[PDB]
Amino acid sequence: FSELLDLVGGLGRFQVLQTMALMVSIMWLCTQSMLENFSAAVPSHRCWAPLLDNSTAVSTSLSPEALLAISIPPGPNQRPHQCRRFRQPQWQLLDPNATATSWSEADTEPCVDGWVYDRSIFTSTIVAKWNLVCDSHALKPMAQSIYLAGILVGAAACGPASDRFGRRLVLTWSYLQMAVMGTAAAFAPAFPVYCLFRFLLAFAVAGVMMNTGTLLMEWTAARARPLVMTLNSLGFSFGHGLTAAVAYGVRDWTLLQLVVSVPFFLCFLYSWWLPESARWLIIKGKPDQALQELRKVARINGHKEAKNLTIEVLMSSVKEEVASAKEPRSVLDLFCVPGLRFRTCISTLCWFAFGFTFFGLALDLQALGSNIFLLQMFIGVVDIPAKMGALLLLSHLGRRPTLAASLLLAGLCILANTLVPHEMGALRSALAVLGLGGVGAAFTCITIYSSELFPTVLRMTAVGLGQMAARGGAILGPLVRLLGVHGPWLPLLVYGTVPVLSGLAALLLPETQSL
Ligand SMILES: *[C@@H]1O[C@H](CO)[C@@H](O)[C@H](O)[C@H]1NC(C)=O
Ligand SMILES: O=C(O)c1cnccn1
């Protein structure tokens, strides 16, 4: 194909504008995923209780601390309990002579009158709106899992649709569905409905990701292609910083979700001015429409020689693309061939670890340190040099040691974060930030390495299985957080162990650098 791009302009004004336009959309798309660090933050809470919260009652001389100690019992954090209150005010507990056996469990009851939440950091969150606390606490990671399952189902449905209807049509309607479903999720009347709309938003997020990447690859001349995928990968890195920047200003979840959704109406509107993939159009037997797209890009780039193209030249020079329809293949072909079984297993395990680890950790920053705005910023700011350093080492050291060292770095940081005591919040923050940086570098490595481990007709299928395994692992990410009832060390032990085991597995892969 590339000779037509050479004649039309292989990296010109059009590709520059298109790359910028698609990067910006990927930034906002990243915010949609990272949002529920802030949209679903857990403010500290207690039961509603008469002496504290009944402002219509008769006045009293006692200070707030005394009233609180008189009304809500102590809990595991050496602080007021978040799910229980005294059945009647424990005036006896005010005296300095008091002891812990002055009351018993029979003196307590659950939050019959509901909960009171701290409004100092966030004005509202879904947790505060629908009381996703105490016996309902599991519903938050469930909501996150339903979103990520939406991405899996959407990626599965995108393939057939992308090949049947085209790259740009599916991209356009995905932008529209993101705008509409995000706006609808902002105004959901009940929690099940919020889950439904987040699922339907995720279904479209998958389409935007896949077709953004594909539509760049089908319009970029090969000499510039690695750079374009690098910039595409940096879009997510800038998205983390943008999430922190937006969420620091908009402290109200409905307004925050709406604010990050509205941009996709503009993305929808400008996706009509992009061209459809010329490869796809010729492959599907529509060469006159392909000629229109090619002459349009030539007009934007300013090449005078647009007269040199004809549908005969297109059909002659793109026949080697058209011929690709001859040979279908299946995922079983990866496991039937005696040697490729081992490569497939280990490669797929690496793809899983990035998904399981990244979306396990990056969606509960509130557990990693004292300030979640700076944490969300830094898992972008560190992501940038991690990705660039990964490319450098991946060029000079080879694929195998770079992937292995990256995953082991991630795993050992996350595991060390179990041992560092809760007093040292800054060091805990730093270790978790470095862990997520290593996970990003590992994503960079495995994307490239999986494109080299396999014979060229199975290459696409191997990467496809890998990406669907990453998406499938992301679903299990948040669910593993439910193990926290046994202590916060256990979820972190799992999130740390998976990348160590897969890193040591990657050491068994064969090196693919030419020498
Ligand atoms: C709140 O205080 C008013 C004072 O008149 C009282 O009538 C009402 O029953 C109280 N309600 C609760 C739940 O304490
Ligand atoms: O590079 C990243 O951070 C990334 C890429 N695709 C999906 C999720 N995350």
Swiss-Prot record:
Major location (coarse): membrane
Effect in UniProt of substituting residue 300 to S: In some gout patients; uncertain significance
One Gene Ontology term of the molecular function aspect: urate transmembrane transporter activity
Outcome of mutating residue 85 to H: In RHUC1; strongly reduced urate transport
Record-linked SUPFAM superfamilies: MFS general substrate transporter (SSF103473)
InterPro entries registered for this protein in UniProt: MFS, MFS_dom, MFS_trans_sf
Catalytic activity from the UniProt record: urate(out) + (S)-lactate(in) = urate(in) + (S)-lactate(out); nicotinate(in) + urate(out) = nicotinate(out) + urate(in); urate(out) + n chloride(in) = urate(in) + n chloride(out); orotate(out) + nicotinate(in) = orotate(in) + nicotinate(out)
Impact noted for substituting residue 428 to H: In RHUC1; uncertain significance; reduced urate transport; abolishes localization to cell membrane
Bilayer topology term: Multi-pass membrane protein
Record note on quaternary structure: Interacts with PDZK1.
Noted disease: Hypouricemia renal 1: A disorder characterized by impaired uric acid reabsorption at the apical membrane of proximal renal tubule cells, and high urinary urate excretion. Patients often appear asymptomatic, but may be subject to exercise-induced acute renal failure, chronic renal dysfunction and nephrolithiasis.
Physiological role: Electroneutral antiporter that translocates urate across the apical membrane of proximal tubular cells in exchange for monovalent organic or inorganic anions. Involved in renal reabsorption of urate and helps maintaining blood levels of uric acid. Mediates urate uptake by an exchange with organic anions such as (S)-lactate and nicotinate, and inorganic anion Cl(-). Other inorganic anions such as Br(-), I(-) and NO3(-) may also act as counteranions that exchange for urate.
The name this protein goes by in its record: Solute carrier family 22 member 12
Gene: SLC22A12
